[PDB]
Amino acid sequence: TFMYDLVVIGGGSGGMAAAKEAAKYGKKVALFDFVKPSTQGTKWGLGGTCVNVGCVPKKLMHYSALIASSIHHDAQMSGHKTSSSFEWGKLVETLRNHIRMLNFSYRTGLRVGNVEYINALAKLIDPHSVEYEDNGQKKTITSRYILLATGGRPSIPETVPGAIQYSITSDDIFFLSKSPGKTLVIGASYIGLETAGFLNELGFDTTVAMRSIPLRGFDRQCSEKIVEYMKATGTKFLVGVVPINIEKVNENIKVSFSDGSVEEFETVLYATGRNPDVKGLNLNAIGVEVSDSGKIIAPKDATSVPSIFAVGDIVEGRPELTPVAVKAGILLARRLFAGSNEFIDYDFVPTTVFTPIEYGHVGLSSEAAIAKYGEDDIEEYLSEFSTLEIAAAHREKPEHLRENEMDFALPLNCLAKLVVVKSQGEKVVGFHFVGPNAGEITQGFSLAVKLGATKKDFDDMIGIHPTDAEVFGILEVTKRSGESFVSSGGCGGGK
Amino acid sequence: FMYDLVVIGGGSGGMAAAKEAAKYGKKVALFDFVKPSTQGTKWGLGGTCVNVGCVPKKLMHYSALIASSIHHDAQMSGHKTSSSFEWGKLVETLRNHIRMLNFSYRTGLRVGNVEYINALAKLIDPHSVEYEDNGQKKTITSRYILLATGGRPSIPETVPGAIQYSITSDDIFFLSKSPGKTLVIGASYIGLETAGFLNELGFDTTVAMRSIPLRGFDRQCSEKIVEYMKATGTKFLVGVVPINIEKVNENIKVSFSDGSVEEFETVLYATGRNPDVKGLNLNAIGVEVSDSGKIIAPKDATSVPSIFAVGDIVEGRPELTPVAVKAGILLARRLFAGSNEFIDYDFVPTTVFTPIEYGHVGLSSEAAIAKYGEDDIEEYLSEFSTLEIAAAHREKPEHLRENEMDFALPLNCLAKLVVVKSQGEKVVGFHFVGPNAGEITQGFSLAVKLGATKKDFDDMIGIHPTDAEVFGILEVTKRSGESFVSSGGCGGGKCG
Numbered sequence A: 001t002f003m004y005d006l007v008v009i010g011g012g013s014g015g016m017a018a019a020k021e022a023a024k025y026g027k028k029v030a031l032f033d034f035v036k037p038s039t040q041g042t043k044w045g046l047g048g049t050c051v052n053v054g055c056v057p058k059k060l061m062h063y064s065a066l067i068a069s070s071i072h073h074d075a076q077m078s079g080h081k082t083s084s085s086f087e088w089g090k091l092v093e094t095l096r097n098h099i100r101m102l103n104f105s106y107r108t109g110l111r112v113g114n115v116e117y118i119n120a121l122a123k124l125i126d127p128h129s130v131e132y133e134d135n136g137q138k139k140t141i142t143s144r145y146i147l148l149a150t151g152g153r154p155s156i157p158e159t160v161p162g163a164i165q166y167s168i169t170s171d172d173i174f175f176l177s178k179s180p181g182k183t184l185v186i187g188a189s190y191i192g193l194e195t196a197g198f199l200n201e202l203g204f205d206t207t208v209a210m211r212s213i214p215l216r217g218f219d220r221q222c223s224e225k226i227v228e229y230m231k232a233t234g235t236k237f238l239v240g241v242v243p244i245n246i247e248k249v250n251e252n253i254k255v256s257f258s259d260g261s262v263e264e265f266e267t268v269l270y271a272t273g274r275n276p277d278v279k280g281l282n283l284n285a286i287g288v289e290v291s292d293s294g295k296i297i298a299p300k301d302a303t304s305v306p307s308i309f310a311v312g313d314i315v316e317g318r319p320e321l322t323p324v325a326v327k328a329g330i331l332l333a334r335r336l337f338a339g340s341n342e343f344i345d346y347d348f349v350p351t352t353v354f355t356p357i358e359y360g361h362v363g364l365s366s367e368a369a370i371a372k373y374g375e376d377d378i379e380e381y382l383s384e385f386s387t388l389e390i391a392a393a394h395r396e397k398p399e400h401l402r403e404n405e406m407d408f409a410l411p412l413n414c415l416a417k418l419v420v421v422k423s424q425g426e427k428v429v430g431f432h433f434v435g436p437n438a439g440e441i442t443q444g445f446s447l448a449v450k451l452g453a454t455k456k457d458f459d460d461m462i463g464i465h466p467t468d469a470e471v472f473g474i475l476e477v478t479k480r481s482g483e484s485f486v487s488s489g490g491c492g493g494g495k
Numbered sequence B: 001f002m003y004d005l006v007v008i009g010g011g012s013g014g015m016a017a018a019k020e021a022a023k024y025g026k027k028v029a030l031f032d033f034v035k036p037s038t039q040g041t042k043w044g045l046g047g048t049c050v051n052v053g054c055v056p057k058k059l060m061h062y063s064a065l066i067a068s069s070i071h072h073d074a075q076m077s078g079h080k081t082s083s084s085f086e087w088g089k090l091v092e093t094l095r096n097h098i099r100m101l102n103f104s105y106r107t108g109l110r111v112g113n114v115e116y117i118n119a120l121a122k123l124i125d126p127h128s129v130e131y132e133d134n135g136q137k138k139t140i141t142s143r144y145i146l147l148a149t150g151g152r153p154s155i156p157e158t159v160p161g162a163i164q165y166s167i168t169s170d171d172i173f174f175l176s177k178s179p180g181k182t183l184v185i186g187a188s189y190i191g192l193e194t195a196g197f198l199n200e201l202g203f204d205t206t207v208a209m210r211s212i213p214l215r216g217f218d219r220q221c222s223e224k225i226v227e228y229m230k231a232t233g234t235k236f237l238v239g240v241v242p243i244n245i246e247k248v249n250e251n252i253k254v255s256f257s258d259g260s261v262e263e264f265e266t267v268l269y270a271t272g273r274n275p276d277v278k279g280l281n282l283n284a285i286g287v288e289v290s291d292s293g294k295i296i297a298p299k300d301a302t303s304v305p306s307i308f309a310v311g312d313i314v315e316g317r318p319e320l321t322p323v324a325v326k327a328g329i330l331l332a333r334r335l336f337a338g339s340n341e342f343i344d345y346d347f348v349p350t351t352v353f354t355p356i357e358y359g360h361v362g363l364s365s366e367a368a369i370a371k372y373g374e375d376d377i378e379e380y381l382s383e384f385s386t387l388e389i390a391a392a393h394r395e396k397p398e399h400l401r402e403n404e405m406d407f408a409l410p411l412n413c414l415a416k417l418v419v420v421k422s423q424g425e426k427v428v429g430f431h432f433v434g435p436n437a438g439e440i441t442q443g444f445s446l447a448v449k450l451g452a453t454k455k456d457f458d459d460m461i462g463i464h465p466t467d468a469e470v471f472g473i474l475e476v477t478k479r480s481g482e483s484f485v486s487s488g489g490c491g492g493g494k495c496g
Ligand SMILES: Cc1cc2nc3c(=O)[nH]c(=O)nc-3n(C[C@H](O)[C@H](O)[C@H](O)COP(=O)(O)OP(=O)(O)OC[C@H]3O[C@@H](n4cnc5c(N)ncnc54)[C@H](O)[C@@H]3O)c2cc1C
Pocket: A009, A010, A011, A012, A013, A014, A015, A016, A032, A033, A034, A035, A036, A047, A048, A049, A050, A053, A054, A055, A058, A120, A121, A122, A123, A149, A150, A151, A152, A170, A191, A277, A280, A281, A311, A312, A313, A314, A320, A321, A322, A323, A324, A325, B463, B464, B465
């Protein structure tokens, strides 16, 4: 008795997934998506945050970093003699051209999967209605179900003066027509670390402002190695120190600090966090119960209004990740229309940080596993080592960080770790890898864990040689045994 | 019994048995010696994988991998790059790192309390062996003996001018000379891999293939590899072997089985390997050796029950490092530390490091179609390009353009699951063609082994953006007959 079966307010990963899956069932779908311009005026097309100002551009930026390293460390050692200069402006061009492809690419995929895209803001009018603008004339449509999927945007703190007026965000940094030069990043979140990662690797004086600890939430050992690697590679780290003032001194940005120090940067980037973009939705009036944290309350993807659902960055007590959006979004479209009652096993969500060395994992940090099971049912088997090709390169620290005459070597680029449970035959509850291609490595092993692997199964695993992944077949050292888990020997993670 | 265990071979299998056996206060001798290659090459401790196998090759492959990115990628990511290449320096990096490992290993044996001796061994009876010392032959006795002398290349003695001229996989990493224009005879994993880095590193590289590429492995996956290498300037003479090789001045002229002729500055026989067992003096002792020369010991135990075998010399087992090692370790456990364990040879992963790497565990589409028939078999797969390379728009060299939209190198990635209808779609085949195959294949080898089903795979949460996440969204099938090409080109996985 409603104009539609399903309306979706948000053209993001979660958004477009639910829409297309819902449409695979002859069910009639509207989708809204409009890009409110950033605090610095930046704006873009269809696909959401992952296509535009997220995972897609990110990785191309990381890739162009990973390249630049090999060039500087590896190219000659592998017998390739090289000049190379870098133009920000062209890297941008490659991003915008590929992203443009995807914006278009996606519009089409919605049309072809038979979904009515409308480029316009939506605003909840009641349990089954929404309001938008059309030619600047406000029209209203009605649905059996509605999906909120609006994503978030960056939080620039309003108590630090000269932030909003000047500082850029994640939404602007892939597409600066201007190389950002000497750059302060405020954040030791996955984004900040990643973003201060490629600026450095791409040869820009990069400082990082860490209020306390790096990557709050993730496993401590693994995060402490990442920071150690990034210091070694020319990223500087002001811990316990945030900005308290930001001002324009000529064509530079002077940045007063909490400890009582000052510094000038050509570009400043607040990576401090994100707030769900739910303010224009008009929630509370409809009756959508939202947390103290602004995030919406809907842990089975269903709000306080049961004709209304939510997914992705906006819903509380779930990771903010693209595939987590998608699975939930697909399922919700199945559960409703195609007789299903599957929900995501949240106990098993892999992720990977693409820091200059990548960190992947599934399940519990050593810390979280020590709590749930106590430091007696907990055994930490690990091996820290160099991947063969990089062992051969003899990668060195930049001069300005040398302390002695045999100080040349970067840290070993890998660390593998399984955390397992004495009282469940050493059942595996934590899988963690710091290295190149951590995600490519993390993936296969996420499913073995989720199929209930033990250390027994791991050691009966036969290696692929040479790989860094094979180290998992021969972890024997332990935290409890206290002895050396280092492996200088360039045999690798197996023989 | 002067000893508890003697080992003739310092290879992967060899050194593993030794050092595990030694972890039990048991007294261990270990022999090595490197009989010089048909072209006079020789090296130190560690075996074929350290010296003239997986170690050097991966560094050579990496230096290739690099060369591509430089030529295809660098610019698009905004790095403008001049680059010329020095064969002699790549060598130097190999030699120096391998030297590190030769030494590195000696120490690991000493420190794990094992008596390494650099000289040839020769069986004298079920419990005795003979070597040379100052050129004076000395003899020792053991409770058990382990044969694992590895293999060496097979250069065919029927084709004239082969042995005197052609090189092998034991020469190629250390050539004092850049090989230039190179014929490789064999589309085995070696030949393919080796013609892979010579090409990527810019040497006119032809491959001479008696029949089909990578005999044994899954056909679709092998056919993509060859297709990718043709696209990148490797040439391929099918159904044609050499029948004559001669030195025409300072080049090598190479007459063919079809009639044709060609000159190379290099020929390399990758046609296979034979177990290095002829000097062991086996049959006299009573070691039953197969029609294939390989030894018969499928429980690592020979016809003489005081005598064992492991690695490339034992029959009906894959020619691999890790299979050597675990078998070698276990046998040292089974004997001396009260153990009953054998390798599950149903689940041995592998990765071919071709310009696109191919990994897999379990059955080729073909092998699964046989065992279970074309009804109980479902082939779910996806062809696509990894997002980084999608952005680069890698294009073909001009001389291989046939039309105006002929620019494309093939998609670099193919994922496939083979599963069994009648066991709830239980997964019996895992196959991946792309970059960081092996890195991808390994994790997935164990999940498969633990009895992953298609449903477990589709309920898998993904990491984005990776190529490996494609395994969480394979829906197309060979049987459904539809296109398995990428809806867009957004990595390996979709952003919604
Ligand atoms: C720098 C960065 C790197 C990241 N890297 C990764 C990564 O590597 N892997 C990963 O899995 N995730 C990554 N993410 C996270 C990923 O971007 C999010 O998990 C994902 O984009 C969330 O999708 P969503 O459907 O919730 O909406 P989003 O993808 O957040 O997109 C929201 C959309 O909602 C639309 N919208 C909002 N309000 C309205 C309205 N009123 N009417 C109509 N449309 C509206 C907007 O147009 C917008 O396009 C990254 C994020 C960032 C910022």
